[PDB]
C-alpha cells in the first residue's frame, strides 16, 4: 500500500539522450551522448531521491553523498530493467534514442562492461522480477554505498536502510527466504558492474581532452571528486553476501 504507492508515483518518466541516430556511429559521439544522458538522468535521480520516504531525514551533506556515490549503480539497474521490459534484454536500452546493439557496444569500447549489463538485464527475466520488486530494490540501491569514515549522521542512514529492507521483505511475503536470497544476490551483482563503469568513466575523463569526449559540468565534478574515493577504497558498497 502506502510505501509502494509512493515509489510508483515518484518513478521518473522517459529520459532521452538527444543522440543523432542519422550519423554513422563513432566513439566520441556515442560516449558524448551517454555522458549527456548521464547528466540528464542525474537530474532525475535528485528529484526522485528527494521524494523517497524518509530521505530528507538524512543530513543534507549525507543526502548529497549517497546520491553522488550511488548514481552509477542506480543508472545501471534502471537501464537493465528498461532493456528487459522494452526489448527483452536483446540490446541495452540506455534511452529510446540511444539503444546499444553489439556494434555500438564495440564502437564505444565498453564491450566487456556492456556484456555484463546485458547479463543483469537478462536476470530480470530469469528471476521473473516484478515491477514492485524492481522499485523497492532500486530504492534500496540508493542506500548501498557509504564512506568508511562514516556519514555525518550514520545512525539515521542505518535506520532508513533498515526500513527499506523491511519493505522488501513485505513485498516478498522457505519460499520467502529463497526469494530474499536471489534478490540480494541480484542487488550485489550491480556493484561490481558499477565499479567497472566507475573505472571506465574515470579514465575517460582523464583523457577526454584527447579523445574529444565532452563531460557536462556536474558529472565532471562528481567523477573527479567522488568517484576516485570509490576507486581508492575510501567509499565502499554494502554487500549482503561476501
Amino acid at each position: 500500500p502506502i510505501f509502494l504507492n509512493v515509489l510508483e508515483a515518484i518513478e521518473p518518466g522517459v529520459v532521452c539522450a538527444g543522440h543523432d541516430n542519422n550519423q554513422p556511429d563513432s566513439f566520441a559521439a556515442l560516449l558524448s551522448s551517454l555522458n549527456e544522458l548521464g547528466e540528464r538522468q542525474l537530474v532525475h535521480v535528485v528529484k526522485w531521491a528527494k521524494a523517497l520516504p524518509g530521505f530528507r531525514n538524512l543530513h543534507v551533506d549525507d543526502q548529497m553523498a549517497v546520491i553522488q556515490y550511488s548514481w552509477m549503480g542506480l543508472m545501471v539497474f534502471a537501464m537493465g530493467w528498461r532493456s528487459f521490459t522494452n526489448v527483452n534484454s536483446r540490446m541495452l536500452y540506455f534511452a529510446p534514442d540511444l539503444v546499444f546493439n553489439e556494434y555500438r557496444m564495440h564502437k564505444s569500447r565498453m564491450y566487456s562492461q556492456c556484456v555484463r549489463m546485458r547479463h543483469l538485464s537478462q536476470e530480470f527475466g530469469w528471476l521473473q522480477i516484478t515491477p514492485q520488486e524492481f522499485l523497492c530494490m532500486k530504492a534500496l540501491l540508493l542506500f548501498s554505498i557509504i564512506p568508511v569514515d562514516g556519514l555525518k549522521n550514520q545512525k539515521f542512514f542505518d535506520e532508513l536502510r533498515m526500513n527499506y529492507i523491511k519493505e522488501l521483505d513485505r513485498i516478498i511475503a522457505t519460499s520467502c527466504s529463497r526469494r530474499f536470497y536471489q534478490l540480494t544476490k541480484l542487488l550485489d551483482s550491480v556493484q561490481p558492474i558499477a565499479r567497472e563503469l566507475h573505472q571506465f568513466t574515470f579514465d575517460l575523463l582523464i583523457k577526454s581532452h584527447m579523445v574529444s569526449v565532452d563531460f557536462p559540468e556536474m558529472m565532471a565534478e562528481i567523477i573527479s571528486v567522488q568517484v576516485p574515493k570509490i576507486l581508492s577504497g575510501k567509499v565502499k558498497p554494502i554487500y549482503f553476501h561476501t
Partner: peptide, 11 residues
C-alpha cells in the same frame, strides 16, 4: 561541495 548539485537538491 558540488555547487550545481546542491542547488538541485535544495531547489
Amino acid at each position: 561541495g558540488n555547487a550545481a548539485l546542491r542547488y538541485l537538491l535544495g531547489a
